[PDB]
């Protein structure tokens, strides 16, 4: 609630991911801006190692919930800003239905004026011509609701939600998300009553960009209380 003040106005973002899926190494670097007042994120991510061995949509969730818009009557339920600048750790298992599993570990914290997300991603059990490794996913991302609950004993929060990726053949590839977040610092944080975040994203491409990349526009709002 004191860290709320760091997200007035527009904040530069740096994202950095080191990944390994079924042995294929790759790095992603992203940069952009976030405006929590309007719950709006604009970012451009670039695969620095070459061609991205997975579809870009499967990395959206891994690639900064502190930029969500919490209505005034919900401010005391915003865990993510309360942890700043000191930051938080974010851990996920992402289980793709009848395909592999991603495991991710990340620090989200300020480094000066910039909010940084450093991620380590680990992927196993992907069938070499599934929807993921066989690049069979549409270049888009559907709207979702992320349900948050408190994790009082780790002084953090948890979330469970389902991501529905559109497959180029009309079917839908689903990805179960299990997530927990813990303060990095010792200072106090807001622990919340169960709410959800409602998200909407637009994916696009930079025509002047030759590297494999993703431009992303996100709008996130908190809801579900009183």
């Amino acid at each position: 609630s004191k860290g709320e003040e760091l997200f007035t106005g527009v904040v530069p973002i740096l994202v950095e991911l080191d990944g390994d899926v079924n042995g294929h190494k790759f790095s992603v670097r992203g940069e952009g801006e976030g405006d929590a007042t309007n719950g709006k994120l604009t970012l451009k991510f670039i695969c620095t190692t070459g061609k991205l061995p997975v579809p870009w949509p499967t990395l959206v969730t891994t690639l900064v919930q502190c930029f969500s818009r919490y209505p005034d009557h919900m401010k005391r339920h915003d865990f993510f800003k309360s942890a700043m600048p000191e930051g938080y750790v974010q851990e996920r298992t992402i289980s793709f239905k009848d395909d592999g599993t991603y495991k991710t570990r990340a620090e989200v914290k300020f480094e000066g004026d910039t909010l940084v997300n450093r991620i380590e991603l680990k992927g196993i059990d992907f069938k070499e011509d599934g929807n993921i490794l066989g690049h069979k996913l549409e270049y888009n991302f559907n709207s979702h609701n992320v349900y948050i609950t408190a994790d009082k004993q780790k002084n953090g929060i948890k979330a469970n939600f389902k991501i529905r990726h559109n497959v180029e053949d009309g079917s839908v590839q689903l990805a179960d998300h299990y997530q927990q977040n813990t303060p990095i610092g010792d200072g106090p944080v807001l622990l919340p009553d169960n709410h959800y975040l409602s998200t909407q994203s637009v994916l696009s491409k930079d025509p002047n960009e030759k590297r494999d990349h993703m431009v992303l526009l996100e709008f996130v709002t908190a809801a579900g209380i009183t």
Partner: nanobody
Amino acid sequence: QVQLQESGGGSVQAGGSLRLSCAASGPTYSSYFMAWFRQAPGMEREGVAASSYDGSTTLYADSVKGRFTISQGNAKNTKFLLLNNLEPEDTAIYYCALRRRGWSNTSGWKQPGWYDYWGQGTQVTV
């Protein structure tokens, strides 16, 4: 959880130079703001030099007078502190400190409570 290799102390005559090392082994997604403090015999820990994770900000205390330089290491969270033009007043044990918590500014860098993980130090004698 996170561990601290520190190396490269020793002894010199007035004017000489030594290079301290420090590396942080831990989760490879973690970044640390890294510093060296030094403690004289019965005096307190004071700040010497400090540098952000990316080498983008580098800070020195008044006792340094542009004689000491931090340089970024080969690897992720590893750095060297080069001590030039050493004088007997610089004799002390030199502790590597790491800050994992995020930060908005570096005004606090000279306080030991700004950090999170400390070394055992190394001796530096002239």
